């Protein structure tokens, strides 16, 4: 990671919190191309001091996203580890997390918009699968909207996938259960089962979110009931807009070996 000075970072408004983290919009003062000085908008992710013992995993997650370069992956700019802080410095995506956007703009998102976003997410995941690189936390809140759809110019929306955060392989069990049905059944049974097939399952859950206007599946179930949901081998209900329900259920296969490749997922999406 590139090291960024604390004095070059300005923390501004809170964007909420993640698991053991707080997130802010900020500004990074930097020398850019041609030596020009810039004050660049950045996403600042801060590991809670009380959870400093996760620092390794915290940075490993981000390092995953910098292992490769791709148009659908959020950029890491660097880290600030001055003093008692563990800070990730990332690209700031103008329109933010997709679940919030879906909840706010549900009354004007149609099947074509959803198909474009689904195809872009699948393209990103196909890139990761070809590189045998596990993401491990695919979900709508980790999809960021770079550009809105502009039908006046035919321009489709454009999204990127953000870093997965601290890995489910080290998180407490109660958090994993709260993350049902994004965390697949085999990872509830054993978080060390994290594998490429994990991201196919979570991709299914994320499509469900995209089709459900930002609703969270199984939100009315407490952790014990989410566990039993897996134990009874239930599937998610079809969204009212049911165009992707079969793909959702095919990806959310309780047999990890049977989940379709992302190449096959993309072929399916292109057939609609
Ligand atoms: O937020 C914006 N851009 C932006 N860029 C990036 C780049 C990387 C990561 C993020 C990001 C920020 C926050 C979150 C969690 N978060 C908590 C409250 S929640 O309501 O559940 C919606 C999601 C998740 C991802 N972001 N976010 C624009 C709208 C102001």
**Does residue 97's CB lie within 6 angstroms of at least one atom of ligand 1?**
yes
Chosen domain end from 57, 92, 127 = 92
User: How close is the Cα of 16 to the center of ligand 1, in Å?
Assistant: 7
Question: Is residue 49 within 8 Å of residue 127, measured between CB atoms?
Answer: no
Indicate whether 146 and 238 sit together in one domain: yes
Task: Copy the structure tokens of residue 169.
Answer: 């392989």
What distances in angstroms separate CA 12 from CA 9, 47, 91, one per listed residue?
10, 16, 15
Question: Is residue 51 within 8 Å of residue 20, measured between CB atoms?
Answer: yes
What's the maximum distance between 2 C-alpha atoms anywhere in the chain? 61
Indicate whether 167 and 63 sit together in one domain: no
Method of elucidation: X-ray
Indicate whether 99 and 176 sit together in one domain: yes
Q: What angle do CA 192, 162, 119 make, to 5 degrees?
A: 95
Counted domains in the chain = 2
3-state SS class at 210: helix
> Residue whose CA is closest, atom 17 of ligand 1?
16
In which domain, by residue range, is 184 found?
Answer: 93-272
Indicate whether 127 and 211 sit together in one domain: yes
CA distance linking residue 149 with residue 228, whole number of Å: 40
Which CATH number characterizes residue 157's domain?
1.10.510.10
User: How close is the Cα of 23 to the center of ligand 1, in Å?
Assistant: 7
User: How close is the Cα of 92 to the center of ligand 1, in Å?
Assistant: 9
Which CATH number characterizes residue 16's domain?
3.30.200.20
CA distance linking residue 128 with residue 123, whole number of Å: 9
What distances in angstroms separate CA 82 from CA 3, 34, 85, 204, one per listed residue?
9, 28, 6, 39
User: How close is the Cα of 15 to the center of ligand 1, in Å?
Assistant: 6
Nearest to 236 by CA among 224, 254, 218: 218
Burial 67-81 (b: 16+ CB within 10 A, else e): eeeeebbbebbbbbb
Indicate whether 211 and 138 sit together in one domain: yes
Q: Is 152 exposed, middle or buried (0-12, 13-18, 19+ CB in 10 A)?
A: exposed
Indicate whether 129 and 192 sit together in one domain: yes
Nearest to 55 by CA among 167, 192, 138, 163: 167
Indicate whether 85 and 169 sit together in one domain: no
> Residue whose CA is closest, atom 29 of ligand 1?
96
Chosen domain end from 74, 92, 110 = 92
> Residue whose CA is closest, atom 11 of ligand 1?
97
Indicate whether 119 and 141 sit together in one domain: yes
Indicate whether 176 and 210 sit together in one domain: yes
Indicate whether 81 and 116 sit together in one domain: no
Contacts of 161 (CB under 8 A, 6+ apart): 72, 73, 74, 121, 124, 125, 135, 138, 142, 143, 144
Indicate whether 117 and 251 sit together in one domain: yes
Question: Is residue 199 within 8 Å of residue 135, measured between CB atoms?
Answer: yes
Question: Is residue 244 within 8 Å of residue 118, measured between CB atoms?
Answer: yes
What distances in angstroms separate CA 217 from CA 7, 178, 194, 212, one per listed residue?
42, 11, 21, 9
Chosen domain end from 29, 61, 92 = 92
Show the beta-strand stretches assigned E in 188-242: none
Indicate whether 160 and 249 sit together in one domain: yes
3-state SS class at 157: coil
Contacts of 244 (CB under 8 A, 6+ apart): 114, 118, 207, 208, 210, 211, 272
CA distance linking residue 123 with residue 86, whole number of Å: 31
């Amino acid at each position: 990671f590139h090291k960024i000075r604390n004095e070059d970072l300005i923390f501004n408004e809170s964007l909420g919190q993640g698991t053991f983290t707080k997130i802010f919009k900020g500004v990074r003062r930097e020398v850019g191309d041609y030596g020009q000085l810039h004050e660049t908008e950045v996403l600042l992710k801060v590991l809670d001091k009380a959870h400093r013992n996760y620092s390794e995993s915290f940075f490993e997650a981000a390092s995953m996203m910098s292992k490769l370069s791709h148009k659908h992956l959020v950029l890491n700019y660097g880290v600030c580890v001055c003093g008692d802080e563990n800070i990730l410095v990332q690209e700031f995506v103008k329109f933010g997390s997709l679940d919030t956007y879906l909840k706010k703009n549900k009354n004007c998102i149609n099947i074509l918009w959803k198909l474009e976003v689904a195809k872009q997410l699948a393209a990103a995941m196909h890139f990761l699968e070809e590189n045998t690189l596990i993401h491990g936390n695919v979900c709508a809140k980790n999809i960021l909207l770079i550009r809105e759809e502009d039908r006046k110019t035919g321009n489709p929306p454009f999204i990127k996938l953000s870093d997965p955060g601290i890995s489910i392989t080290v998180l407490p069990k109660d958090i994993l259960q709260e993350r049902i049905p994004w965390v697949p059944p085999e990872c509830i049974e054993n978080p060390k089962n994290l594998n490429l097939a994990t991201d196919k399952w979570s991709f299914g859950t994320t499509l469900w979110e995209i089709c459900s206007g930002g609703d969270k599946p199984l939100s009315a179930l407490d952790s014990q009931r989410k566990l039993q949901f897996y134990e009874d081998r239930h599937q998610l209900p079809a969204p009212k807009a049911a165009e992707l329900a079969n793909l959702i259920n095919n990806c959310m296969d309780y047999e990890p070996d049977h989940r379709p490749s992302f190449r096959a997922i993309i072929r399916d999406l292109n057939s609609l």
